[PDB]
Every structure is written in structure tokens, then in C-alpha cells.
Amino acid sequence: PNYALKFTLAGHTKAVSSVKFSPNGEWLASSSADKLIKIWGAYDGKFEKTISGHKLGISDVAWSSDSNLLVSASDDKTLKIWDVSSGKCLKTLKGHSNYVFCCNFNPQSNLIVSGSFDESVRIWDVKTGKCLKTLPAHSDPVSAVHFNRDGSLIVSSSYDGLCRIWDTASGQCLKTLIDDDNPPVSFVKFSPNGKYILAATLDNTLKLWDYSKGKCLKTYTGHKNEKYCIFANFSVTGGKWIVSGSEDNLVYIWNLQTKEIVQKLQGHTDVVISTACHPTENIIASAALENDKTIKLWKS
Amino acid sequence: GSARSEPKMSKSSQYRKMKTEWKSNVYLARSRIQGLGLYAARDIEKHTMVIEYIGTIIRNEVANRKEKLYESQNRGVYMFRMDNDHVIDATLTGGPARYINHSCAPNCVAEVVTFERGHKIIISSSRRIQKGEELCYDYKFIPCHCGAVNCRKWMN
Amino acid sequence: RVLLALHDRAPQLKISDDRLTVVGEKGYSMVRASHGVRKGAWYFEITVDEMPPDTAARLGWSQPLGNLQAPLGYDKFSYSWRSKKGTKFHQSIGKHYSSGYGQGDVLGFYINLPEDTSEIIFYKNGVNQGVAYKDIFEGVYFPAISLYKSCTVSINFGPCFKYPPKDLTYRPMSDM
Ligand SMILES: [Zn+2]
Numbered sequence: 325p326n327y328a329l330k331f332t333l334a335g336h337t338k339a340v341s342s343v344k345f346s347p348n349g350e351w352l353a354s355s356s357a358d359k360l361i362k363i364w365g366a367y368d369g370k371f372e373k374t375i376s377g378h379k380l381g382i383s384d385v386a387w388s389s390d391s392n393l394l395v396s397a398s399d400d401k402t403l404k405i406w407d408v409s410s411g412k413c414l415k416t417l418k419g420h421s422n423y424v425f426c427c428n429f430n431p432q433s434n435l436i437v438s439g440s441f442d443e444s445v446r447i448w449d450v451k452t453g454k455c456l457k458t459l460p461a462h463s464d465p466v467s468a469v470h471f472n473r474d475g476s477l478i479v480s481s482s483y484d485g486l487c488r489i490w491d492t493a494s495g496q497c498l499k500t501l502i503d504d505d506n507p508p509v510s511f512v513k514f515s516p517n518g519k520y521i522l523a524a525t526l527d528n529t530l531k532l533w534d535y536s537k538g539k540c541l542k543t544y545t546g547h548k549n550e551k552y553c554i555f556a557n558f559s560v561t562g563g564k565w566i567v568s569g570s571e572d573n574l575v576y577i578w579n580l581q582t583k584e585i586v587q588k589l590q591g592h593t594d595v596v597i598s599t600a601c602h603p604t605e606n607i608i609a610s611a612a613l614e615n616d617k618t619i620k621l622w623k624s
Numbered sequence: 625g626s627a628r629s630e631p632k633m634s635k636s637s638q639y640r641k642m643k644t645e646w647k648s649n650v651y652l653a654r655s656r657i658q659g660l661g662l663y664a665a666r667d668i669e670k671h672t673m674v675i676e677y678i679g680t681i682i683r684n685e686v687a688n689r690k691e692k693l694y695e696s697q698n699r700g701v702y703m704f705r706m707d708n709d710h711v712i713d714a715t716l717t718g719g720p721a722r723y724i725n726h727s728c729a730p731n732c733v734a735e736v737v738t739f740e741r742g743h744k745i746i747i748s749s750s751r752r753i754q755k756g757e758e759l760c761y762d763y764k765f766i767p768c769h770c771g772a773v774n775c776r777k778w779m780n
Numbered sequence: 781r782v783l784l785a786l787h788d789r790a791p792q793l794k795i796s797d798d799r800l801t802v803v804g805e806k807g808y809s810m811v812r813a814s815h816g817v818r819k820g821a822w823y824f825e826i827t828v829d830e831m832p833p834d835t836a837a838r839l840g841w842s843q844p845l846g847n848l849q850a851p852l853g854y855d856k857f858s859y860s861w862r863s864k865k866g867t868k869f870h871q872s873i874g875k876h877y878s879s880g881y882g883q884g885d886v887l888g889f890y891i892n893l894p895e896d897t898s899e900i901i902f903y904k905n906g907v908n909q910g911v912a913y914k915d916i917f918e919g920v921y922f923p924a925i926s927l928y929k930s931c932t933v934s935i936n937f938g939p940c941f942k943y944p945p946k947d948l949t950y951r952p953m954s955d956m
Contacts (some may be wrong), residue, residue, distance in 0.1 A: 339629040357626035381625030399625045421769075423627050442769050443659050460659035463701075484698040506698045508632055551631045597628070613629050683807050684790065685849035 325587045326624065327577055327608065331369045333619035335362065342384045342555070343600045343609040343619060346391040352600075352609060354619070357381030361394070363408065366607055369621065375408060383425050389433055397424040403438060405453065415453045419446045422465075430471040435492070437478065441465035457495070462486050468511045472518035479521055481509040487521050487533055501538040503531065510553050522556040524549065530556075530568075546585040548572050557601040559608075567608055569596040575610050575622065592616055635737060639746065642673040649674065652723070653756075657770045660723040661758045668753040674732070675759075677704055677745035679718025682711035704734075707743060728776040730762040782937045782954045785814035790849060801934050804837070804927030808851035812842055813923040813935070815956055819895050823950035824923060825888035825936035825943075828881060835928040837863040839887050841900050842924035843917075852926045857919070859900050859912045863928075868912045878909060886943045888936070890950060891921060906943045 338358035345352055345366060352366040359381060363372035380400040388394070394406035395417075403417035403424060417438060426439040429450070436448035445459040445466060464483035471478060471492075478490035486509075487501035507525040514521065519535035528547060531540040548571040559565035568576040575589035575596070594616035600609050606624040642649070655661020668674065682690060690713070694700055700715035702722035714722045731753060737746040753759070763780045770777075783799045793811050794803040802811055813824075826839055838851060842858035853860030853869030860869045866878035881887060881904055890901040898916045902909045925933065936942065937954045 339626060341626060341628045357629060383626060383628055399627070425627070458654075458656050460654060463659060502697065504696065506696055510632070551633070553628050553631075683809070683849070685809065685847065685851075688847075688850075688854075 325577070327575070327587070327589060327606065327622050328624070329589075329591055329620060330623045331621040333364050333369050333609075333621070334617055336360070336614075336617040338381060339597070339614035340611045340617065340619060341382070341553075341597060343598045343611045344384075344387055345600045345602050345607070345609070346387070347389065347603075349602065349604065349607075350391040352619075353385070355382070355385045357383060357399070361385060364619070366602070366609070366621070373408070375406070375411065377411070383423060384427070386427050386429050386436075388429055393429070395427050395429075395436055395438075397427040397438065399423050403427065403436075405436075405450075417446075417448055417453060419455055419458075420444050425466060426469045428469050428471060430475040431473070432475040435471070435475070437469045437471075439466040439469045439480070445469075459490075459495070461490070462488065467509060468513065470513045472514040473516060474518075477514070477518060479512050479514055481512040481523065483508045485509055485523060485525065487512060487523060487538075489521075489535075499536070499538070501533055510549075511556055513556055515558070516560070524554075526550045542580060542583055544578070544583050546578075547576055552595050553597055555598050555600065557599050557608075559601045559606070560603060561606050567599055567601055569599045569610070571595040575599070575608075577608070589622070591620060593618075636739075639673055639737070652720075655725055655758045657725050657727060657758075657768065661725045661760070662723065663756045663758060664753070665755065667755055668749055668759075670749055670751050672749045672753075674747040674749065675721055675724075676747065677712060677714075677719060677721060680713035680716060681706065682713055684709060687711050704745065706745070712745075724759060724761065726760045726763060726779065727758070727768060727770040727772050728778065729772055729774070730760045731757065732759050732761045734761060782815040782956055784935075785812075788812050788814060788844075800936075801932065802925050802927065803932075804930045806929045808836075808926050809849045810842075810847060810852055810924055810926050812844065812925070815937075815953055816841075816921040816923070817891075817893070817953075818918070818920055819893045820891075821893065821948070821950055822891050822921075822953055823888065824953045825886050825941055826923070826925070827886045827934040827936055827942060828883070829934055830932040831863070831883035832929060832931055835863050835931065837925075837927045837931070837933075838869070839889070840902065840912075840924060841889060841891055841921050843919040844922055845919070846924075850926070852924045856917070858924055859916075860924075861902050861909070861912070870913065877912075886936070886941075888941065888943060889923070890948060893921075903943070903945060906945045908945075908947060 336358050340356040342355040354362040359378035361375045380398050383397045386395045392408040396404050401420045405414040420440050421444050422441040428437050445461045461480050462482040466480055468481035476492045480488050485503050485507040488497040490497045503525050505525045509524040512521050512523050521533045523533055531543050552571055554569040557567040559567055564580045566578040566580050570576045573592040577587045592612050594612035597613050598611035608622040609619055611619045650664050653663035702714050706712050735746050736743050765780050768777045789795055790809045792805045796803050838853050838860035840860045846855040846857040853872045863880040866880040868875055868877040885904050888903045892899045899911050899914050939952050
């Protein structure tokens with residue numbers, strides 16, 4: 325465990341919100357809220373092209389199989405259906421009335437969910453884009469949408485710790501999960517099997533929650549997450565690894581069985597908004613907000 | 625522009641006739657004000673009774689710890705007072721009526737008919753409420769998301 | 781005569797018809813006495829007669845502008861000490877003091893109150909339980925009782941006390 329700095333991805337006008345790697349080692353664009361998506365690289369920061377022309381800042385952008393097809397979850401209550409080599413507004417998604425926080429293409433590449441805050445969540449079509457359903461996704465605003473390994477389950481996060489695994493074919497979720505905290509959950513996600521969900525309970529104790537029982541496996545220590553948005557990552561390249569984001573200008577990389585403090589990596593100048601992981605190689609990015617305006621690549 | 629970069633900072637008998645049809649009255653339907661609400665697969669007529677506010681009776685003082693309970697799991701945002709003596713909870717175990725919302729044109733009011741087991745919050749009608757109209761009550765103690773005609777866009 | 785009060789009650793509380801005994805209500809609401817002082821070292825007695833298994837009842841001095849419905853120890857007006865696991869309370873927070881009281885004792889309470897020319901001590905079978913806190917506020921100091929299921933405790937104000945200690949110079953409240 326000697327993960328060393330390799331590159332630096334600067335050149336931002338506003339704060340960077342997210343990094344999300346390509347599924348097979350292709351790209352990592354500037355998924356920020358700066359009205360800019362510059363197609364940066366994952367291996368060496370290879371600048372490809374400029375895809376911009378937005379009205380407001382993008383909360384997060386989606387991703388595709390070829391890491392090209394996008395849809396903008398911007399803050400102007402609209403969504404364009406994007407392509408890299410087009411630069412053209414195909415259609416417009418309408419049905420929100422607040423911040424479009426999050427949107428996803430499923431791993432089968434045939435759905436466009438779009439998360440909202442006043443529960444105007446609509447699951448859209450990739451081809452047509454017709455108004456289908458308002459969803460009562462929580463009692464609270466949504467802070468995560470995700471699709472599992474195959475694409476029949478939708479996890480969603482709340483401001484009181486609702487791990488609702490929404491069904492794709494029917495629309496009725498199965499199991500309600502809870503903690504004794506009152507957690508404003510910034511992010512939940514699936515696993516490579518869909519059974520363990522890492523929520524956000526904000527007293528420096530983030531828990532990996534089971535599918536059926538709703539218990540936790542191993543409650544980690546030594547991390548800093550009480551107010552700010554921090555993603556949730558795992559690594560399958562070599563052995564067991566735990567990678568997350570930080571707040572105190574560090575890079576959080578640990579192991580699952582230990583629950584210790586064995587590696588933290590200085591090098592940032594802001595609260596780490598985002599880290600991410602790569603399946604075959606230990607190529608790890610680490611993004612931060614406006615007081616850094618860089619995305620620093622890491623590699624063993 | 626980002627919210628992610630910003631940190632998160634005669635009456636009794638007809639009433640029991642209504643008591644014998646609680647599955648038959650409504651089903652748990654939605655409302656696009658916020659999440660759910662309550663619609664009907666029927667036309668609720670004039671002087672038709674609907675629901676009773678039941679659940680877990682708080683004593684005189686236990687609300688002063690229930691307000692601390694509201695800071696753990698954010699449990700009850702569904703309040704309605706019984707009286708000066710007591711309050712009724714509907715969050716741990718009790719009445720499932722915790723999805724009756726409010727728009728600033730409420731189509732129901734609160735009325736009290738008293739049994740031997742104490743004062744009970746009783747709902748009736750005064751008009752023929754049609755199919756699918758959301759039942760919602762005036763509060764009289766966060767802005768609304770309804771889009772109503774001549775709407776105050778508040779709670780009370 | 782040093783006795784109880786009329787409207788110092790909740791309707792679920794039953795001040796008994798002897799004005800020497802309070803009957804417990806199964807919840808937790810505060811009943812208080814009627815004759816108190818403001819400055820000086822004074823004394824009375826609560827004779828705890830009978831107790832069920834696994835109870836919770838808190839006794840101590842109080843001021844009348846507190847909560848009429850609280851378990852005792854909820855406010856800064858008053859202190860308390862619980863019959864189970866022996867805990868002193870400041871706004872009803874668990875701060876471990878001793879082990880609580882049982883069946884067949886007298887809980888006769890001492891007060892200390894200086895002034896420019898203040899602590900609350902609890903007794904139990906004459907045992908000096910120690911000091912709860914120091915430098916309490918200004919007001920009229922009533923006793924206060926909140927109980928379990930309908931048990932039996934007695935109050936006492938006469939100079940023929942059951943357990944008179946010999947460690948402090950105190951006065952009975954019946955001199956009023
Ligand atoms: Zn309205």
C-alpha cells in the first residue's frame with residue numbers, strides 16, 4: 325500500500341462535483357457544475373475535446389458503455405440528451421420542478437432515471453422520452469439513484485436513512501432499512517452483487533448495510549464525513565480494498581477486515597468531494613471543490 | 625451553481641356503520657403535492673364519514689420527550705393534538721392516517737364526537753366529494769407544492 | 781398547619797384524604813407540598829412505607845414555577861434521586877450517584893441556604909448520602925413527589941421524627 329500521485333487535472337471555473345470512471349478504462353470527464361464537461365483522460369489526463377454550452381451547473385452527469393453518451397442533471401430543471409460527437413440538443417426532459425440532482429443509464433443501457441428533490445422523479449426512455457410516472461421515492465429529497473448488476477433494482481437515499489430498493493418492472497420496493505441515527509444520507513449505492521448498501525450516517529460512522537437483515541458487516545473508523553458530500557467506492561483489482569473520500573485534505577484508502585488507519589495520503593487543498601475506482605488496475609482519482617479546482621490521479 | 629458544493633445546512637350507529645367499512649372506504653392512493661395523499665374509488669357523499677384520528681395517547685408531559693424523539697430517525701412529522709390533556713401519536717404503532725396532506729383549499733375540517741372511552745376526533749362530510757379528490761384538512765395551529773386556485777401556499 | 785395544598789395536583793394524581801400520604805399514578809407526573817422556605821437550613825421527612833418490585837420514584841426539594849406534570853428532576857428548579865439504580869438528575873440526565881431506595885425507609889431531606897449578610901442533601905435510614913450539587917437558585921422551596929404504580933409513601937413534619945440524625949443542626953418545618 326504505497327499509492328503515489330501521478331497527474332493533476334486543473335482548469336475549472338466552478339467547483340468539481342464528481343469523478344466516475346469508465347467501465348473498461350476509457351475516459352474521465354470533468355463532471356462538474358461549472359457549465360463545462362471537458363473530456364479528460366483516466367491514464368494521463370489526456371484532453372480530448374470541449375463539450376459545453378450549458379445554462380446552469382450540472383449536479384452530476386451520466387455515463388455510457390462507450391463512456392460517451394450523457395444526459396445533463398443541471399440545475400436549470402431541464403435535461404438534454406447528449407452525445408460526444410454531436411453537440412446538439414436531441415430532446416428535452418420535462419417534469420422536474422427543482423434541482424435535478426442525479427440521473428443514470430442502467431447497465432443494460434435502456435433507462436434514464438432522473439432524481440429530484442420535491443419527489444418529481446420520473447424514469448425516462450432513452451429513445452423517445454415521454455412523460456410516464458411521478459414516483460413517491462421517499463418522504464425526503466432524493467440524494468442517490470443507482471441500478472444494480474443486472475438492472476431490475478433501484479436504490480435511493482433519503483434524509484432519514486431510507487434504503488428503498490425500488491423495483492424496475494413493477495414499481496413497488498421491497499424492504500425498509502433503518503439506523504438509530506437520523507441520517508441525512510448523501511449517497512447510497514449497490515455492490516457487485518446488489519446485497520450490501522453503504523449509506524451515510526453522519527457521526528463519523530458510515531455503515532455497509534445488508535439486503536435482507538438490514539444489519540451492518542463492519543463499521544469503519546477514522547473517517548471524516550458529517551456535513552459534506554463524499555462518494556463511496558470499493559476495489560477489486562488485487563485483494564480487498566476500501567477507498568473513500570475525505571474532508572481534511574487526505575485520500576482515504578483502507579482495507580475491509582482491518583477497520584484501522586493504515587493509509588492516508590496528503591496532497592489536496594480542499595474537502596474531497598469525490599473519489600472513484602477502476603476494475604482491473606489501481607487507477608484512482610480524487611476530486612475536490614472550488615478551493616482546490618483539481619482532480620488528482622493516483623496509482624500504486 | 626450547485627447544491628452539492630453547498631453543504632446541507634343516531635350519530636353513533638351510522639358512525640359504527642362507517643367503522644364496519646374501513647377497508648371499504650378508500651385505498652391508500654397518492655397525491656402529487658408531496659408523495660402520497662388520499663383519493664377515493666367512490667364518490668364520498670354529503671354527511672359521509674371518513675376517518676378517525678387514533679393511535680398512541682401521549683400524556684400531559686411525554687411530548688417534552690417526544691420532541692427529543694423527533695431528533696432521532698426524524699420519526700413524527702405527523703402531528704394532531706387531542707386536547708390540553710393529551711396528544712395522539714401515529715408514528716410507532718397506531719393510526720396509519722399519517723399521509724393526509726394539506727392544500728390551502730382543504731375539503732375537510734376537524735370535529736369531536738365523544739364516546740365513553742373519551743373524546744374522539746371524528747370526520748364527516750358536508751358535500752358530495754367526487755371520485756379521486758384529495759381529502760385534506762385545515763391546520764389552524766415550508767411552502768406547499770400543489771398549485772391551487774386562490775392558494776395561500778402555507779400550512780394553516 | 782404545615783400540610784399539603786388543594787390545587788397542587790393533576791387530575792390523574794390522587795392526594796389522599798389524610799394529607800399525609802400520596803397515592804401513585806402509573807405514569808409520571810409531579811405532585812408537590814405546600815409549606816416551604818427561602819433561606820436557612822430546614823428539614824422534613826418522607827416515610828417510604830411500601831414498594832413494589834422494579835419501581836422508579838424520585839424525591840427532593842423543588843420550586844413551584846416548575847413543571848406540574850414532569851418526573852422529578854426535569855428542571856433547574858429542582859433536584860431528584862431515583863429509587864432504582866440511585867441517580868442524581870440535573871434536567872433528568874443520567875449521572876450515577878448511588879444505589880436507589882427500597883421498601884421500609886424514611887427519606888428525610890435536608891436543605892442548606894446561605895446569603896450575603898447552597899446544597900441539597902438526602903437522608904435514608906440516617907445515612908448521609910452526600911451532596912447532589914452546590915449553589916442552587918433563589919425561590920420558595922417545596923418538596924416534590926412523583927411515583928410508580930399505586931404504592932404507599934408517607935410524609936412527616938412533626939418533631940417526633942422516626943430517624944433523627946445527629947450530624948447537623950436542623951429545624952422542623954412545622955414551626956411555620
Ligand atoms: Zn394549496
